[PDB]
Ligand binder design. Structure first.
Ligand SMILES: Nc1ncnc2c1ncn2[C@@H]1O[C@H](CSCC[C@H](N)C(=O)O)[C@@H](O)[C@H]1O
Lengths: 265, 265
């Protein structure tokens, strides 16, 4: 009789909320997509085992083109659930799917889950200081994306931190690393020469957030660009002017250079 | 030797993640703070019942002043859990507590949970378009804070949305409503005349995020200022220019006026 959008969280099958699980367990049909983000600490099997249902995985095309033909038809006579990594409506276009549900006469409900958007709090950077966000897109062909560069500039100019989602090619199983993101930005700087991103720029890397032992490292681009941050997914953050307490955390927890402790008020 | 920062999520005792609940159960001691925010849809008893552990509630002073003397000692020879509403470390003062753990020779891990910071994605507004965040605080005595007004101005100026956390009197359990927030903003406008928040401003109200029946409403201040959005907690959003898809969601899902499709896009 209804459609539930249930988030699965950051890293493993246990990042789903209790609410999400109890509801998923009772649904008649369970669908899911795993292309918007990467859950590096679980497997389909482990999720199916936890939920106790067979999970039909949909591709980007299945959702974007046939969500109303594959999922919605069943939601009219049964309790159906649509699973996604992290939070279902964050950094995705899944919100529009609720409009499709409505027009098909299907009531929908949303069950949230931990999101990278807020998990960045673990980096010690004040969440309220994050500005506009952006995604570092893999260049393809003769098209070289640069919008994410402008976002960093605008935020930094206002003293705001910039969260950078990193590209992903689910089918090709290619997950952009922080290292690759840094390389691309240095290239954009050479083009625009805005002083936005250089070897001296302080940056923060968060890898496999959600895991019990995430990789959190802060430092200058010149020293981190070739560092190994472990398996994906990775997120890159270009901080704005730091509060002393932020700097203290980056140094004590993310092993940043003790010189950042001396902020230039 | 291990301290666990566990997020309780958005609204009720089921908003904790499966990972958080299980870890909390295996802990010898369980502490909790309910001053950075509250869990409006549940009670301490229901949370205790779910965890199956006695939960010692700590005040603000307990944490900020005596965290190392109340929680860390037991964490040296036991598994201790520290529960907080939402996602740990989103509240600005939490991060520092991890540094205290380190200096006490105690390991700490963070178990995430849904945060309102990310749950706002249910409003249909693109998460990447949210800029700096702010808190609307109740004026008191001869003190009238207005910095949240400037945040809205700078974000909107760059086409970004502004998330406004609303004040809360933790002990008294008094929640500032979106209505009160709107009234305060109109008063600040009358004083600053910046043309940032008026009867014609479009706003979005999200009430009881996390609940299965949250209230999602969007409209002009003149029409929503005295509307009843239901029980707390309420969150207010002043969106910037809208992408057509955001507007269609606000209209179809949040009951916004068709007018927004031409005036705010
Ligand atoms: N656990 C994690 N650690 C680091 N980055 C992560 C992450 N989970 C997601 N991301 C980042 O976000 C991108 C997917 S964007 C989709 C995000 C999702 N709805 C959420 O709420 O988290 C990834 O390519 C990656 O850069």
């Amino acid at each position: 009789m209804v459609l539930y959008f249930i988030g699965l969280g950051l890293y493993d099958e246990r990042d789903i909320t209790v609410k999400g699980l109890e509801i998923a367990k009772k649904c008649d049909y369970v669908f899911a997509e795993f292309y918007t983000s990467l859950m590096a600490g679980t497997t389909l099997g482990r999720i199916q085992k936890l939920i106790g249902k067979e999970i039909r995985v949909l591709s980007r095309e299945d959702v974007e083109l046939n969500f109303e033909n594959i999922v919605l038809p069943l939601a009219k006579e049964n309790d159906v659930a649509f699973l996604t990594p992290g939070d279902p409506l964050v950094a995705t276009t899944h919100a529009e799917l609720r409009i499709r549900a409505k027009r098909a006469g299907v009531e929908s409900y949303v069950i949230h889950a931990p999101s990278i958007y807020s998990a960045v709090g673990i980096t010690g950077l004040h969440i309220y200081k994050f500005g506009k966000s952006a995604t570092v897109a893999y260049p393809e062909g003769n098209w070289f994306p640069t919008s994410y560069y402008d976002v960093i500039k605008e935020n930094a100019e206002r003293g705001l931190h910039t969260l950078l989602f990193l590209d992903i090619k689910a089918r090709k199983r290619m997950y952009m690393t922080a290292n690759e993101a840094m390389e691309l930005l240095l290239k954009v700087e050479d083009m625009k020469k805005g002083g936005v991103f250089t070897d001296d720029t302080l940056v923060v890397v968060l890898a496999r957030a959600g895991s019990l032992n995430p990789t959190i490292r802060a430092g200058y681009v010149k020293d981190l660009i070739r560092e190994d941050f472990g398996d994906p997914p990775h997120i890159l953050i270009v901080p704005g002017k730091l509060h002393i307490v932020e700097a203290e955390y980056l140094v004590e927890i993310a092993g940043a250079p003790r010189e950042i402790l001396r902020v230039n008020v």
